Design a protein around this ligand. Structure first.
Ligand SMILES: [Fe+3]
Ligand SMILES: [Fe+3]
Ligand SMILES: [Fe+3]
Ligand SMILES: [Fe+3]
Lengths: 238, 200, 238, 200, 238, 200, 200
């Protein structure tokens, strides 16, 4: 079983987006009015699931082949790779990185998405990968296209891939979004602007990686994820 | 002062969270192994319970697109981190509320007692993380039980909540769903009877 | 018939790309070694075709419908609009604007293109439009994806749409390329870098136009084209 | 000094120029009305000629992806700017060299005489603009005829070329293709016998 | 009748003042807690009243004469003129411009105004004008004085003239306030501070116009108004 | 991106809005032609109705200084843009709530059906724009009728409001004031029963 | 974009390249173990060949100061990376052209067939790297054989060279020097008959 031997660096809730961000409309009715109750870390908070024993299919990380009904998806073939480290710069091995996205046109494979851009019969948009010993993950997919949404009258989400990172604990567990370098829609999105600090928005921008690109085949993007720093317990209860 | 590398900022899970994290609930084809609401298999030790609840927003309206992640100890009060579908019990599980089912379900056992960092016993609880559109950074909460009144009064985490009326929002009511032991835990994100959310 | 009543501003061949630009490999064997012979402008140079009477089909400007085999193309639905003016800022009416591009994956509909990204059965990539009285043109298409080419070992063309502009004369006739705002591949392309002046590269960057976008439907890009200034003849042959 | 708005910079036509500007030559389906190599219809006035040529690069190799645009006067020496496919003659036309046909063809009439700005008569010529991959900004040239020796010696544009050996590169040789009057105009972009290109 | 041919550029609600601005006390109880619901533009939103046939009195725009009980108002005689254009810079002709203000001492002609500065027997404070073919409007009035109000204990409104502009649609309809160049009360007022962006406040400041002033008579202030950009519909419903 | 000229920012209409836009409601003398609450002259086609209502703040207290502007189609579903007081029907009108009359009134006909951009019929509605002290930028809303339930259930605009309970705030309750068909439409700016406001 | 550490820039090998890399070719004393032109010992498997050639500049004059490095697979199509002078065959070797010997020599076996990344068989080739004074960054080339015409026509690398006439510059002509199988491979750095150089 799991033990209480780790302490996690307290989250900077001024770096992270606030609960109440008015421009992002749905946050108004879905944000607590009462203050969060601070509790010390215990075994309930400092431990979490390990997904090393989960049965991963061969194409779970490859979105170009994991839906396959008879062909290849239409769109810009890209590799989305990066490293998962903690605040101390320590790699996070054997961690679950889950991702989901829209197709080249910005259409998501869900019943609630009635956007006029057609579905790609060869694209699912779901991906999962367990990080290696050095904390590296890699996905092969197509660059998702931007999509409109009912927030403001002309609000468009920048091209993005949603990310879900488990980490060593439920305390480190994080769901975020990846944006693409140079996309002019980034400073205009209310979901991006929910983050007050501009330096924090930069941590979400995946950068073009020509070094990791496959010549005459696919481009690449680097997205490094930083999770809460893990430290050993010291001087607790004397 | 000393500044470490900044943590990657959180963003909302979005309206379509289910296509990537709750495939069956999204009506999309599933993969061989999925992480879902069946924490305990029928032959697992402990009192087998069914957990259900609804998520309410600030207007008292149902949140039919929520995604919940649970972390709990087994009947013996031990956390099983090694997730595998072949196991009789898994401490982790995911559940969701959909447009087709505005109520989330969880099949598990009643958790045993675990001590805090100071060695003081905490009352039987289930750690819940709530994600959805409109929630920029996930909300952490705990599910306590009403038939554990003696243990709930002594819990060090529950006693950190200043007002006793707010402690009640974390207590699941015992009921019965189809002749099976069940507990109802409704979460009110904002307003009247707002659920206590934690920071750690 | 056409008459000799106009004079065109002499081309700044230091603004325009040079014939010999080594990094763009094919230019080595396809560039003149001898100097261009300067000749005065006459009726042969100052006149050109007028395409007002050409039979334009209803969907010639709409690449979302001009190929149609049973559906819509997969990709980011966009409007590429702009104005065609001359160096004096005077609009260029009833001029032919022709364009061609790749699909969302960077695949062109030609037999010589053996790039692994699939063809879109609903996308042709050919478009034509005659400018209005104010010099405005508009195309509805999908955002083309970048594509690799055999120049350097890892050379990737930025997402682009090729443009062909007729103008009032064969002297104003121009073929160029449109690039998209923020695309990180622009400062890396040898075809873009064939233009020495960085301020000239900026004239080729189509900018995001949220004002011309159709809410809940398609985005928009503005690309203004500047042709050689046209002036009346004065004091010639005394 | 006075600076006007800068002209939009040129870029190469690229390898796939044909899909947008020479649809039939690209093997792609055509639209109702296309701009192509048939300048003159069989019942047009003047001496009906066939023009053909090959485009050579600096290594003496064929350019099988070139795109050429022609501008010429009619038999009466007048420029017909109003392009319409119903017309007997159109002063404009497009031709190309493909991998299937490394030679370009043009069906037109021999142009009449036109005067320059100074009123001096220019010899019968066809204005050609050459586009292709590797050509950053199009090349302008003129096609003169060998049976117009007297007019070619007096031409003010042809006499602006300092060396008489370079003037020869602009002169098309009279030949016969299938019992029809034809002229051959080969263009050498670079090197030995390099074609004179203009700037205006 | 009016037709659905125009589309209007979406309002930047971060440029405009927010609903909840606590320093302006009355806004607390009169601001919606729920988010605005975004709806697309239809004939109901893209059309609006045309006031070209409304019967304007000869002195409707002249506040020095439109109240007249036997004399001229006490105060700094000024001309308030300008142009009403849209975001594209296109003039807005035949549009209704309405205005109201206080007298030279800050006293408004209303029953609830019990400010001890007297009323001017020759001043009402109401005006209206229809813009000409080129979007120009003009008013003749006296410069209003500042007035105190029960917000903070020592709060003073700067000298202002309220403006009401209709535009081509109910989508363009705007109510605003004009302030005067150099007034030291402008950066101290909570109603002016309701606007977050300081460059936005600058558009509300009327600039002294010595060129439009009548020598030995009255001064002039120029106030240009910019309404939402109007564009024709394109590529709607394919 | 393309930056256009910025729109002139909005400011509150102020406590004295009535002196410049509702001269009679204030108590100040009127001009020859005023824009007021009589949209339809007694001889106008369609079902003649009286609209009344009160505006409430977040404390449930009456707003006795509000100004409202209305825009509606005629009985035939056509928008009459050319405002003239000689017309039987005008699509535009103005009303207000004073300290002497905390209830606004509007005399008009029931609007006919109009199609949206997509060609789908919208339910009979009146477009309202609310201005007052404390309201920095005006509030847009729509007035729907309770006796048009079948059309209200099929309206594209009303169906854009996620929650069904919030759609009811835009529906005016039918009553009778001295034998005349009347609809009551109370606007609650903030709090319990808050009226849906639009952006376009 | 992601900027990695930049590679150390290249500089010419200089006129005295032989003193540090071709000690015997210079005329300076050698060390115990040198990397030279004897890739295959007389007892190595496969068809033993002698390779010779001259390096020409752009004026058609001999380069009497060049340095060449070679890399090839053995007769079985395997690359032997572990360089040792005790091995029967070494995949790597060095040769040069001096003022005393304007012709470089190489003693090796004919390389076997190797597959590219895609699994397609490449024709028998020797990878060459040319260094000399005036050559700022080394020139990469390949040596193909004339008696392997069927394999040369199906090679993916040789077929990447657009023009067929330029493919012939990479093909070594078979001859006989004292009963030994010999292939002549002249490298023309610039001008007429210029050798194809690669980038990878
Ligand atoms: Fe998304
Ligand atoms: Fe291209
Ligand atoms: Fe005021
Ligand atoms: Fe040296």
């Amino acid at each position: 079983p799991a033990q209480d031997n780790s302490r996690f660096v307290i989250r900077d809730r001024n770096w992270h987006p606030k609960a109440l961000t008015p421009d992002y409309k749905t946050s108004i009715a879905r944000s607590p009015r009462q203050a969060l109750v601070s509790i010390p870390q215990s075994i309930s908070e400092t431990t979490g699931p390990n997904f090393s024993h989960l049965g991963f299919g061969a194409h779970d990380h490859d979105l170009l082949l994991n839906f396959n009904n008879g062909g290849l998806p239409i769109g810009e073939r890209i590799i989305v790779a990066g490293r998962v480290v903690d605040q101390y710069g320590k790699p996070v091995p054997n961690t679950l990185v889950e991702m989901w996205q829209a197709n080249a046109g910005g259409r998501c494979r869900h019943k609630n998405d009635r956007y006029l851009a057609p579905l790609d019969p060869n694209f699912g948009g779901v991906g999962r990968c367990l990080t290696d010993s050095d904390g590296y993950y890699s996905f092969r997919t197509i660059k998702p296209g931007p999509y409109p949404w009912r927030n403001g009258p002309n609000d468009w989400r920048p091209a993005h891939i949603h990310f879900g990172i488990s980490g060593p604990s439920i305390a480190t567990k994080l769901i975020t979004q990846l944006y693409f370098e140079g996309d002019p829609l980034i400073p205009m999105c209310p979901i991006v602007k929910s983050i007050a600090n501009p330096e924090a928005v930069q941590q979400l921008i995946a950068k073009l990686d020509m070094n990791n690109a496959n010549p005459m085949d696919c481009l690449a993007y680097r997205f490094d994820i930083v999770l809460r720093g893990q430290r050993k317990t010291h001087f607790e209860n004397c | 002062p000393i500044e470490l590398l900044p943590e990657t900022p959180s963003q909302t899970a979005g309206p379509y969270v289910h296509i990537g994290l709750a495939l069956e609930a999204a009506g999309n084809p599933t993969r061989d192994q999925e992480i879902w609401n069946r924490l305990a298999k029928p032959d697992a030790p402990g009192e087998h319970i069914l957990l259900l609840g609804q998520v309410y927003d600030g207007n008292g309206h149902l949140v039919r697109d929520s995604f919940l992640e649970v972390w709990q100890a087994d009947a013996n009060g031990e956390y099983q981190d090694a997730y595998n579908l072949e196991n009789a019990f898994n401490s982790f599980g995911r559940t969701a509320t959909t447009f087709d089912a505005g109520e989330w379900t969880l099949h598990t056992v009643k958790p045993g007692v675990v001590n805090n960092a100071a060695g003081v016993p905490m009352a039987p609880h289930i750690n819940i993380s709530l994600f959805a559109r409109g929630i920029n950074i996930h909300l952490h909460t705990r599910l306590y039980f009403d038939d554990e009144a003696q243990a709930n009064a002594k819990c060090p985490v529950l006693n950190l909540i200043e007002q006793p009326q707010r402690r009640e929002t974390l207590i699941a009511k015992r009921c019965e769903v189809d002749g099976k032991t069940a507990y109802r835990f409704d979460i009110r994100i904002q307003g009247e009877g707002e659920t206590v959310f934690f920071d750690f």
